[PDB]
């Protein structure tokens, strides 16, 4: 495992343990170390949502998407979940 993958597994272990602020802090180190890797932003956004920090989550999602290419094999469940939120938002 590279250092990034080790730091990432630690953030993920904290996240799975329900230690969300702790995970955020590790995820911040992913962003710092690899600023063009969407995974830090995506992981940090989930931990933020768990904490009810919705505004910073939105900021992390927008930032991570700047470094994400197209995804051409999207699952149907994902589309149902996204379209549900998109539409709830638009109402």
């Amino acid at each position: 495992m590279s250092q990034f993958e080790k730091q990432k597994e630690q953030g993920n272990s904290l996240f799975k343990q329900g230690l969300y602020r702790e995970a955020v802090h590790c995820y911040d180190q992913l962003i710092t170390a690899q600023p063009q890797n969407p995974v830090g932003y995506s992981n940090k956004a989930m931990a933020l949502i768990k904490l009810g920090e919705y505004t910073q989550a939105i900021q992390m999602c927008q930032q991570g998407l700047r470094y994400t290419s197209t995804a051409e094999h999207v699952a149907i469940r994902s589309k149902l979940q996204y379209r549900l939120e998109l539409a709830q938002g638009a109402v």
């Binding site: 953030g11 993920n12 996240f15 799975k16 995970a23 995974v39 995506s42 992981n43 989930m46 931990a47 469940r77 994902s78 979940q81």
Partner: peptide
């Protein structure tokens, strides 16, 4: 992993 999970 699932939508609700980390990566």
């Amino acid at each position: 992993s699932r939508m609700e999970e980390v990566d």
